[PDB]
Amino acid sequence: TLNGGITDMLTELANFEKNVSQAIHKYNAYRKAASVIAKYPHKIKSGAEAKKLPGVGTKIAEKIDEFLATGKLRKLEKIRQDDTSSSINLLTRVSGIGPSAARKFVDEGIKTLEDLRKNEDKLNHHQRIGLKYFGDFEKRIPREEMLQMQDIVLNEVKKVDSEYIATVCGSFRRGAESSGDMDVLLTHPSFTSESTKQPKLLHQVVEQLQKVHFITDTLSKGKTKFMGVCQLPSKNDEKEYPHRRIDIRLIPKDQYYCGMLYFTGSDIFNKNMRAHALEKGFTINEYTIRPLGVTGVAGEPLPVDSEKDIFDYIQWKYREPKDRSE
DNA sequence: CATCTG
DNA sequence: CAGATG
Ligand code: NA
Ligand code: NA
Ligand code: NA
Q: Which ligand is nearest to the CA of A148?
A: 2
For C3, which residue's CA is nearest its C1'?
A100
Q: Which domains does chain A have, with CATH numbers?
A: 1-82 (1.10.150.110), 83-139 (1.10.150.20), 140-262 (3.30.460.10), 263-325 (3.30.210.10)
Q: Provide φ and ψ at A151, rounded to 5°.
A: -55, -40
* C1' of B5 to CA of A204 (Å): 26
Closest CA to A170 of A260, A40, A80: A260
Closest CA to A314 of A285, A286, A275, A287: A275
Q: Which ligand is nearest to the CA of A239?
A: 2
Closest CA to A9 of A55, A58, A77: A77
Q: Provide φ and ψ at A32, rounded to 5°.
A: -65, -40
Helix (H) or strand (E) holding A289: strand A289-291
A230: β partners: A215, A244
Strand C contacts in A 213-232 (CB under 7 A): 227
Residue A220 CA to ligand 3 center (angstroms) comes to 23
- Cis peptide bond prior to A179, omega within 30° of 0: no
Q: Please report the sign of the dihedral spanned by the C-alpha atoms of residue A263, residue A144, residue A218, residue A252.
A: positive
Annotated catalytic residues of A are: 63
Q: Is A184 annotated as a binding residue?
A: no
| Contact status, residue A229 vs residue A215, Cβ threshold 8 Å | yes
Q: Which nucleotides of C are covered by protein (CB under 7 A)?
A: 3-6
Query: Torsion angle of alpha carbons A106, A109, A114, A120, nearest 10°?
Result: -80
**Nearest nucleotide, C1' to the C-alpha of A286?**
B1
Residue A142 CA to ligand 2 center (angstroms) comes to 6
Helix then strand then coil, in percent of chain A rounded to 5, is 50, 15, 35
Residue A249: which residues within 8 A CB-CB, separation 6 or more?
Answer: A183, A184, A185, A186, A224, A225, A226, A259, A263
DSSP string, A301-324: PPP-SSHHHHHHHTT-----GGG-
DSSP state, A291? E
Closest CA to A7 of A79, A56, A74, A78: A56
Q: Is A92 annotated as a binding residue?
A: yes
Query: One-letter amino acid identity for A315?
Result: Q
Neighbours of A210 (CB within 10 A): 16
Question: Which whole-number Å values give the CA distances from A6 to A47, A66, A236, in the listed order?
Answer: 10, 11, 53
